[PDB]
């Protein structure tokens, strides 16, 4: 399933350029309300996917011993991932945190080899190193890069974790269902302690934007986990890294983001890497 990687990439790119549009059209909105309402809205989409694909529910497969990996990955990538990424946005810029979130596959390509004993010794390493070089050639810095690598470690380790559970008796739709359930619970606990207001979600326009963003993000995650299931964690993240090309394209086309010559070079480098990987 090689095209599923690129499909996950394009759909996360659409989701991200919808999120940018949302946060640009609304000022008072905060990422904690957005993530919570996104997850609460997407839980329905996941129930729909599960009910349509196979039988109603299978809760005997949600064993407590094995799926600790998926819950720890969800609470390690969802809540604190977004928190530290917004911290990086407030610290060192709105577009460098996303660049590091795209250079994330380094920690994944390390862990999948060392921890999961995967065999990617020389094939994928070159494409991923070239993508990394392009992202670093695109660009207080010692703390900004520290928080950025803290985000990247988590977002690259959720993949290694999610490929640990799905080795035996956990399909793509359930291993993601528990992920979204636990991320929603975590964001609920976080909001409840801070008493964050929910008045903004009642808007119909915001609800429409949130449902299209949740649909895009969820198709992205579903294709990405179908890839990981049958293409592992070593390349299934490298193939998905292509979403930066898309994100930049849709930002310079639709949202009217200014185009510079350096971003064209970085996009050419990363597309060269993605083409090298196959």
């Amino acid at each position: 399933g090689v095209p599923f990687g690129l499909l996950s990439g394009i759909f996360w790119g659409l989701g991200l350029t919808v999120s940018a549009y949302i946060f640009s059209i609304f000022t008072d909105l905060s990422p904690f309300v957005v993530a919570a309402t996104h997850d609460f809205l997407s839980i329905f989409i996941l129930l729909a996917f599960l009910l349509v694909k196979e039988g109603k529910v299978r809760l005997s497969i949600f064993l407590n011993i094995r799926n600790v990996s998926v819950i720890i990955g969800a609470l390690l990538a969802g809540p604190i991932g977004m928190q530290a990424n917004l911290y990086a946005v407030k610290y060192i810029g709105s577009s460098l945190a996303s660049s590091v979130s795209a250079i994330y596959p380094a920690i994944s390509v390390l862990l999948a080899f060392f921890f999961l004993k995967h065999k990617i010794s020389k094939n994928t390493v070159f494409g991923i190193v070239l993508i990394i070089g392009g992202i670093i050639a695109q660009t207080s810095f010692y703390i900004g890069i520290l928080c950025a690598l803290v985000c990247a470690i988590a977002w690259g380790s959720e993949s290694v974790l999610s490929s640990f559970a799905m080795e035996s008796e956990l399909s793509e739709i359930e291993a993601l269902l528990i992920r979204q359930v636990t991320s929603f619970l975590s964001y609920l606990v976080i909001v409840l302690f801070s008493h964050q207001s929910f008045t903004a979600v009642a808007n119909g326009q915001l609800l429409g934007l949130m449902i299209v963003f949740a649909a895009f993000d969820m198709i992205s995650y579903l294709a990405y986990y179908i890839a990981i299931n049958r293409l592992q964690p070593a390349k299934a993240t490298g193939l998905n890294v292509s979403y930066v090309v898309w994100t930049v394209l849709f930002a310079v086309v639709f949202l009217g983001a200014p185009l510079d010559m350096l971003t064209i070079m970085t996009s050419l480098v990363v597309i060269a890497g993605v083409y090298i990987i196959i």
Partner: nanobody
Amino acid sequence: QVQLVESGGGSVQAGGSLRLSCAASGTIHAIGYLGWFRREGVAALTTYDGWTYYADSVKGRFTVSLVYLQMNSLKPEDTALYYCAAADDGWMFPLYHNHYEYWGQGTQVTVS
């Protein structure tokens, strides 16, 4: 993709030495790591560079050449079917019977 044939197996008295041979046939141009198992990792050579990784239990007693496995100082614990193996792509992770996709039939070696 590649057919592996082993030769040289048999019965050997403990305290001597023995040589085992592996011949590969087919698309043999892009195979990086060659191996020798008994499925534990006992030997693995790199083709281009020419390094050989061994098992700590036999490191210094068995030797690899380019595939020939020369086993010295035999012990009755070495009675096993030895298998050949190859790897499409490899840099630093030998001795694992999940990296190597091309597998042979193996020949029996019995130490007395």
